[PDB]
């Protein structure tokens, strides 16, 4: 999972 | 799909030896050149007295029968 | 289709 | 591909096919944004409006004494005189999805020879004609 919450 | 390692006592120093491999890795062994623990095999003398197949048991050679037939 | 009112 | 030149620029939004009258040495083109067909000399002079009040000209060809145009709206192929654009005639109407036009006719390569025709097998791959009856050889990409 990529860090950017969006 | 990696191979990991850790300290045998407490599981410290946990690292991944490989990147993510393409297929799932299954089965693992060392290759060691030094001879492992050696003991005198009673099956090495007159087949331990057994008729067919034998292996060194805890106390002495245990005889065994083949996979085919009723014995 | 199936025979009902 | 050499000696690039700009002939006509200005009110040319939504340009359409250029076409050429080889005999008269004049260019014809349509401008959809103004709904006109324009004419000009090949040297970049005498630009003028020939046909106007068109909707969406798409195909354009000059043959004999006449100009043929397909108007994609109006769904029509029409024919008009190349001199001042009078004597309008409908060849076909209610044609959906009109596009380009061209006139199939016999052309004599003997009466319009150039450098490449006068010198066959001169170039290994491609021969391209050059003004003054010369020719420049070319190679594939």
């Amino acid at each position: 999972x990529x860090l950017x919450x969006x | 799909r990696k191979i990991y390692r850790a300290n045998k006592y407490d599981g410290s120093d946990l690292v991944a030896m490989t990147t993510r491999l393409p297929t799932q890795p299954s089965g693992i062994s060392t290759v060691v050149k030094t001879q492992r623990q050696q003991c005198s095999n009673p099956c090495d003398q007159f087949n331990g007295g057994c008729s067919h197949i034998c292996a060194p048991g805890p106390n002495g050679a245990e005889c065994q029968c083949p996979h085919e037939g009723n014995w | 289709x199936x025979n009902x009112x | 591909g050499t000696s690039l030149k700009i002939l006509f620029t200005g009110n040319l939004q939504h340009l359409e096919v250029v076409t050429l009258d080889i005999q008269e040495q004049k260019l014809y083109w349509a401008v959809t944004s103004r709904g006109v067909i324009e004419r000009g000399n090949v040297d970049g002079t005498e630009r003028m409006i020939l046909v106007h009040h068109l909707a969406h000209p798409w195909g354009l060809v000059v043959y004999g004494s006449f100009l043929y145009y397909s108007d994609e709206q109006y769904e029509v192929i029409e024919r008009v005189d190349k001199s001042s654009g009078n004597n309008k005639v409908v060849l076909r109407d209610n044609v959906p999805y009109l596009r380009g036009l061209r006139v199939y006719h016999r052309r004599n390569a003997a009466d319009s020879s150039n450098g490449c025709s006068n010198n066959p097998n001169a170039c290994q791959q491609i021969c391209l004609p050059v003004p003054g009856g010369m020719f420049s050889c070319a190679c594939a990409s």
């Binding site: 999972x1 950017x4 919450x5 | 990991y4 | - | 068109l54 909707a55």
Partner: protein, 424 residues
């Protein structure tokens, strides 16, 4: 904070009295930390790249930290008068944990070694230890307020996959994992007594422990303060507080009062947000006004000096308004039923607004003086070149009753031109 709505809410712990705190000007709020001593509210916005502070009721919003803030995620507070300190985490290039006194004066970096994607922060108040987490190196650690005595509470353990946020209570630590989609429990000193608290269908992002021990009481230094607008707790000087005021206010020489900044600023419209930036090229704060987040397709903006309103259009064919403070974000009036509008121009003298709708190919006028909205089409696409082809921009001269608009061409109709007309 709601990411889709772009709002901050609050409720009682029994689920009653759900009420809005910030209704506007949030894009991606990562973490919230309330100041229970100074009655302030601190949060980090990923999109705006700022650390912001407000009164706890949302009233007076200002940008606290803006210089080298790339991707702020974490945020923790120690409002006890002895400490009066703040912490935040940034996971941009050169990731780090930063320490600063609230009001953002005494800014320092405490952790920058062996860090990559820092995420989540919490304070052990009794020991004054800042716990922090890592999503790339996959560890949980803690250290002193100065970054010394750095220690590992979970490290080189496969159970961390992508931890996000963190919480402490007595001798337990709890954290949310976006990878395993779980919230976990472990002993906050050696990680040794691990269990799953619960399994979540979606990614669990935020966590907090509701308990009086998590907010120790402290004597309030700002109780006797006479500062107008914001009063922030500070770690410097015996006073231990500093007066501040929202975006677009001076600090007065008498350091307790603030006056509204009447100087101009440039409103920069961008596809999904509107920024007010200072006309001075050296000032790179992007805080001349509270940003207007949640724009669908931003092209043009327009303002009214009186009432300090900012106007823009939206996709469904309507016009929206907001104060420069954010306080009154509402849909103003239905604009046109025949498609979206592009251009805006406001007649401030006569309280009219002019807009162009390329969908209907017309220039229309709308009133904003009375209670009832009245709309009319001024110029429409007739056959003649003098009409409207495809209107892009629009400018007005109320003093001389002239209207100007930039127009693309139409086939066989209007040419691409700059046109002028009377405002009627």
């Amino acid at each position: 904070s709601d990411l889709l709505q772009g709002k901050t809410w609050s409720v009682f712990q029994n689920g009653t009295d759900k009420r809005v705190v910030h209704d506007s000007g949030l894009s991606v709020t990562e973490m919230i930390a309330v100041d229970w001593i100074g009655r302030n509210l601190y949060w980090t916005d990923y999109a705006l790249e700022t650390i912001e502070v407000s009164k706890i009721d949302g009233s007076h919003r200002t940008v606290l930290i803006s210089k080298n803030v790339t991707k702020p995620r974490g945020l923790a507070l120690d409002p006890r008068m002895g400490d009066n300190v703040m912490f935040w985490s940034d996971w941009g290039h050169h990731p780090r944990i930063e320490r600063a006194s609230m009001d953002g004066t005494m800014r320092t970096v405490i952790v920058q070694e062996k860090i990559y994607w820092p995420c989540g922060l919490s304070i052990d108040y009794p020991n004054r230890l800042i716990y922090f987490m890592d999503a790339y190196l996959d560890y949980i650690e803690f250290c002193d307020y100065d970054g010394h005595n750095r220690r590992q509470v979970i490290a080189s353990d496969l159970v961390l996959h992508h931890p996000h946020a963190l919480t402490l209570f007595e001798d337990f630590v709890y954290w949310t994992d976006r990878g395993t989609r779980q919230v976990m429990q472990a002993n906050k000193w050696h990680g040794g007594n691990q269990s799953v608290v619960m399994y979540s269908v979606h990614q669990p992002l935020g966590i907090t422990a509701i308990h009086p021990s998590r907010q120790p009481p402290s004597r309030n230094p700002c109780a006797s303060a006479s500062c107008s607008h914001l009063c922030l707790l500070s770690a410097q000087a015996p006073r231990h507080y500093s007066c501040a005021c929202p975006s677009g206010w001076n600090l007065s020489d008498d350091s307790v009062n603030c006056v509204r900044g009447d100087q101009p600023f440039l409103m920069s419209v961008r596809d999904n947000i509107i920024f007010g930036i200072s006309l001075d090229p050296e000032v790179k704060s992007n805080d001349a006004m509270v940003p207007i987040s949640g724009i669908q397709h931003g092209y043009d903006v327009e303002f009214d000096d009186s009432e300090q309103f900012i106007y823009w259009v939206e996709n469904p064919g309507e016009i929206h308004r907001v104060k420069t403070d954010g306080s009154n974000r509402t849909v103003f009036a239905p604009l046109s039923l025949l498609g979206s509008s592009l251009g805006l121009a406001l007649d401030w003298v006569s309280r009219n607004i002019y807009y162009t709708t390329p969908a209907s190919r017309s220039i229309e006028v709308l009133t904003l003086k009375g209670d009832t909205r009245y709309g009319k089409t001024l110029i429409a696409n007739d056959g003649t070149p003098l009409g409207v082809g495809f209107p892009v921009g629009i400018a007005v001269d109320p003093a001389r009753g002239k209207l100007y608009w930039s127009d693309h061409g139409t086939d066989s109709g209007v040419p691409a031109k700059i046109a002028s007309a009377n405002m009627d």
